[PDB]
Amino acid sequence: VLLLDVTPLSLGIETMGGVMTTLIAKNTTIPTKHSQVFSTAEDNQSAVTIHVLQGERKRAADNKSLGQFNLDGINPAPRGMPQIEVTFDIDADGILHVSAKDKNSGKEQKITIKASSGLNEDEIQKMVRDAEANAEADRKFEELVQTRNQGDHLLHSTRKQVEEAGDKLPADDKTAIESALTALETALKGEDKAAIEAKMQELAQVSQKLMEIAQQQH
Amino acid sequence: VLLLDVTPLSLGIETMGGVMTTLIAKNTTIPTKHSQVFSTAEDNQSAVTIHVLQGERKRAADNKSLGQFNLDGINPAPRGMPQIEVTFDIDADGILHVSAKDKNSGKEQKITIKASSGLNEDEIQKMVRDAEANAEADRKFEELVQTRNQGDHLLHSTRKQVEEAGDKLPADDKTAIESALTALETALKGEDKAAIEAKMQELAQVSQKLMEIAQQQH
């Protein structure tokens, strides 16, 4: 062939922390269909937002927004337990269909995005340059988001484990641990990567008895 | 400058499933130091293996091995709870130091890798070509590893939640759910991505009562 139609920019979704997670890489040949499985961030969460993005930046708000929809009716479950399968499907016509299916509830919602959507060529090449210029800033934002989500998961798990421990956990431990979850939860509200790790570290340091009781539980 | 020393290949570690996780990207200028935080895969796991790799393939066994060491003395904890911080540090001399520090125990182990280690230029360019040729196979392996780890996490969480539920969970639910965990645990032992999702899906479908009881618990 003298010609290929390829994706000039990556296509994906915004995930927790405001990051673009790619489903279809830049320069993938049409037609194509990719899927990935995602979950909820909170206990009892009943819907997820699917924000569809085009571009090469690690920050979602720095990419082009192609549209957004929600899938609701997610049944009550602990966070990270629902299986929401997101499929990006680009047909031979260059039309993108993005669906999300809850594998428990069977419920599905879809957005369809015309082949003329998104960034025009001047913007496309502006985007490839901006991604290139900014590899450092975006790497730093990617690592901060990944620390913050780890801190959140640690925040959430340790609270659950305090719960299932109840009386097994000595008075002094619970006080040290709860003090740490409060400062951790504070730190999570800033942009200081070292401060979040310092609060996560304090928590690892005071939670050793809890960790044993939780390991022993199961 | 007329000259830069840059990393000719990515440098990283093997993570769960046999995948290379990068800490220092290809073409990063020396000197440089990057860190990322990782955890255990099993309840009560007392050590982690740090296998250091050079190259651009998503499969660890397809990259160059620069060495390997363990950090032990990890105190008993539920999986995913220990914070093992891995730092890749390349000094002005092109020497790589890779340390792992347990933030709870304070324990640290290190390997130091001379600037002459790893792949020579012919191998370097053979590696960039092989990565390039194989983007599809590696993407497929990356998605299979990510499904398998999700299935494992779901396997493990649902068992824990069966536990903390005990009598709250009706007889019929526990039987349907345990049948599913057995087939899920079977599927995890193959290489069939669809079969693992089908078993994870069966589990989402029978666990709805459990998910409510677990959500209600906390």
């Binding site: 979950s39 997820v48 | 999700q150």
Partner: peptide
Amino acid sequence: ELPLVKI
């Protein structure tokens, strides 16, 4: 009501 979580 929240973006998806990369699991």
